[PDB]
Design a protein around this nucleic acid. Structure first.
Length: 367
DNA sequence: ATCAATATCCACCTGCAGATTCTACCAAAAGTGTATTTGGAAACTGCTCCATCAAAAGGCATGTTCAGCTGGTTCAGCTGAACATGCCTTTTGATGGAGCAGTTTCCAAATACACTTTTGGTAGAATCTGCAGGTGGATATTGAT
């Protein structure tokens, strides 16, 4: 395979110590170094099963080794590494209560937000106590699909199966529930560097950029970006300037700050949507300009590589092409969800009925 | 050697090709109503193709079942020839019912409106059923004679 990297590494660091070379060149060199050491994540560290399929994933923001996960049957799990304290569990109905959105609480880490097929955007503890419901369908067969949160703004946002989005405060205060789309809202997210423009994606083959404080007039939006197929995810950058989008058939798109309408590059990659599989969500890496996605081969997709395996692919953002591929037998499932740690030293993967941890090996000999 | 079957010829004769004449129904023309097609919202049903257990499909050992073959025994249908008998047929005397054609009286659908049951929508509990025991035939496996 490819993975060639080269450079005059330490020199640049000293160049940075002299002021000659600019910081983005440093960021590029250490991005390459990060890829080189990610070539040693090949040894899969840990595996974890449980009951009904995995649907949503989330990282403990402050802690590297802690992670939370939510199932197809409303079964939530909280798991920490190097603890061995037999991780924490909570069950649900198990049939039609699929948790589908899951973000940690920025305030109380022993709390968590959740969006469920039951029709209940809730705030609940890992010990089982429901602290507070935020919204409700009040009529079954109409449920939520999307959820996200912001701490700098102290806001909650959630999306439906019909095309209307809801926006609440941390203490209630609902001033929202206007309709935005014609179909289900697959993903949604707020800017981390801003507080008052939003992004939402839907089955309508359109992804919309809103201004949550200015617009109130039922599709008096700010921007609307089209696509050729429906969209499973539209995720913001940490920096805030790059919006990543991933469709259902075969595509990834990078939109910029600079003219949201036009895209900067198209990254073709197979992640074909499917009914009983968990929907695929590309994701950023929090401290570089990389992209990470899970692959799902299609015999009809125009493959550039002659070898098409199920594996975790890692591309470069501002170029378009690939830079690394992680693969491990005994894990021949399809990695629906993949998310790097906010810390930057660990990767979590959610496959059907399985959760995988990929971190570096070392510790050749103890003393 | 056969010995009716088919190939050949020839009288004949009656269905059959062909010509004539009456007739009911097919085509064209202007009009209309009414089935159907089309544009377009929307809803709902099948294609979907992993991730997973768990009955179901495959495959291999043993054992039994029976089937296409043998040969023999039994015996029952084929057919000659002779002779009876009702079929043919034909032939015509007898008749009544088929079909037509005129007369009478039934008796069905056209239409408008106002009930009236029928079909869902939707919950509650009554019956079927998984599961678990548990009786008792029962059905094969040895057992006394």
């Amino acid at each position: 395979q490819i993975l060639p990297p080269c450079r005059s590494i330490v020199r640049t660091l000293h160049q940075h110590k002299l002021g000659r070379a600019s910081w983005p060149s440093v960021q590029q060199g250490l991005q390459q170094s990060f890829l080189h050491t990610l070539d040693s994540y090949r040894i899969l560290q840990k595996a974890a099963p449980f009951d009904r399929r995995a649907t949503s994933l989330a990282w403990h923001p402050t802690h590297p080794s802690t992670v939370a996960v939510g199932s197809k049957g409303g079964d939530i799990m909280l798991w920490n590494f190097g603890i061995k304290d037999k991780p924490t569990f909570i069950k649900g109905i198990g049939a039609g209560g699929s948790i589908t959105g899951l973000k940690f609480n920025p305030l109380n880490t022993n709390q968590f937000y959740a969006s469920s097929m039951e029709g209940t955007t809730r705030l609940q503890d890992f010990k089982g106590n429901i602290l507070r419901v935020f919204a409700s369908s009040d009529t079954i067969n109409i449920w939520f699909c999307s959820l996200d949160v912001s701490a700098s703004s102290r806001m909650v946002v959630t999306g439906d199966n019909v095309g209307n989005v809801i926006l609440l405060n941390m203490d209630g205060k609902e001033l929202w529930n206007l309709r935005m789309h014609k179909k289900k809202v697959t993903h949604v997210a707020l800017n981390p560097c801003c507080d008052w423009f939003l992004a939402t994606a839907s089955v309508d083959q359109t992804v919309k950029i809103w201004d949550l404080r200015q617009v109130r007039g039922k599709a008096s939006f700010l921007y609307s970006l089209p696509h050729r197929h429906p969209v499973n995810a539209a995720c913001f950058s940490p920096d805030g300037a790059r919006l990543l989008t991933t469709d259902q058939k075969s595509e990834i798109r990078v939109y910029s700050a600079s003219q949201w309408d036009c895209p900067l590059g198209l990254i073709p990659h197979p992640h074909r949507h499917f009914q009983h599989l968990t929907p695929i969500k590309a994701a950023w890496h929090p401290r570089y300009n990389l992209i990470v996605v899970g692959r799902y081969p299609d015999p009809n997709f125009k493959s550039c590589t002659p070898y098409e395996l199920r594996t975790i692919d890692v591309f470069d953002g501002n170029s378009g092409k690939m830079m690394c591929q992680l693969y491990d037998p005994e894990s021949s499932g399809i990695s629906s969800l993949n998310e790097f740690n906010p810390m930057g030293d660990t990767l979590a993967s959610a496959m059907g009925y399985h959760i995988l941890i990929w971190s570096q090996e070392e510790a050749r000999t103890r003393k």
